Design an enzyme around this catalytic site. Sequence first.
Site, PDB file in Angstrom:
ATOM      1  N   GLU A  11       0.793  -1.190   0.000  1.00 44.58           N
ATOM      2  CA  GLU A  11       0.000   0.000   0.000  1.00 44.58           C
ATOM      3  C   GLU A  11       0.828   1.243   0.000  1.00 44.58           C
ATOM      4  O   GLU A  11       0.306   2.268  -0.373  1.00 44.58           O
ATOM      5  CB  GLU A  11      -0.802   0.034   1.296  1.00 44.58           C
ATOM      6  CG  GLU A  11      -1.887  -1.050   1.353  1.00 44.58           C
ATOM      7  CD  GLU A  11      -3.027  -0.834   0.380  1.00 44.58           C
ATOM      8  OE1 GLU A  11      -3.812  -1.694   0.103  1.00 44.58           O
ATOM      9  OE2 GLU A  11      -3.065   0.330  -0.203  1.00 44.58           O
ATOM     10  N   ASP A  20      -6.357   6.856  -4.788  1.00 43.97           N
ATOM     11  CA  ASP A  20      -6.403   5.398  -5.065  1.00 43.97           C
ATOM     12  C   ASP A  20      -5.978   5.125  -6.475  1.00 43.97           C
ATOM     13  O   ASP A  20      -6.202   5.929  -7.379  1.00 43.97           O
ATOM     14  CB  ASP A  20      -7.906   4.843  -5.232  1.00 43.97           C
ATOM     15  CG  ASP A  20      -8.275   4.167  -4.005  1.00 43.97           C
ATOM     16  OD1 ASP A  20      -8.584   3.031  -3.928  1.00 43.97           O
ATOM     17  OD2 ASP A  20      -8.173   4.992  -3.018  1.00 43.97           O
TER      18      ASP A  20
END
Length: 164
Positions: A11, A20
């Site tokens: 991540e 995102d």
Amino acid sequence: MNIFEMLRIDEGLRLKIYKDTEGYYTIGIGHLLTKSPSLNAAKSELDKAIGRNCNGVITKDEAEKLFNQDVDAAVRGILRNAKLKPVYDSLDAVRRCALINMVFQMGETGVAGFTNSLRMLQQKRWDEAAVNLAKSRWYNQTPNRAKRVITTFRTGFWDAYKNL
């Protein structure tokens, strides 16, 4: 290697609100704030999440605090889920981490939708399940990450993460 190190490779860490792969507003270690297009809605969720006026920016420490909550919630969601629990219980420690990683990224619901692959993982048909998992939007949209998770379910070792 453990669940936190693995997820942090996947991540990354960003201390300012960002979008995102999906275009969604996120902060920290993959902590989705809102699926809404306003940076303002995001900022507001941020302040609600941290309990301060952040102005779109957090500390390392606040990032790790959110990460600890998200991981905890992912595990608890797995354990509470009728479709997920049985697979989780059947798996070894390393493969358990691969399922937690999927849930963190895609939510309980999303993962519970992989009916056929779940069935194969329960049966311990590793190579078959790896081929089936790859036939998904998930793999096509974030192939390098999906491939790491998939190798993990295939082998039962941490090699995909050694490189990284």
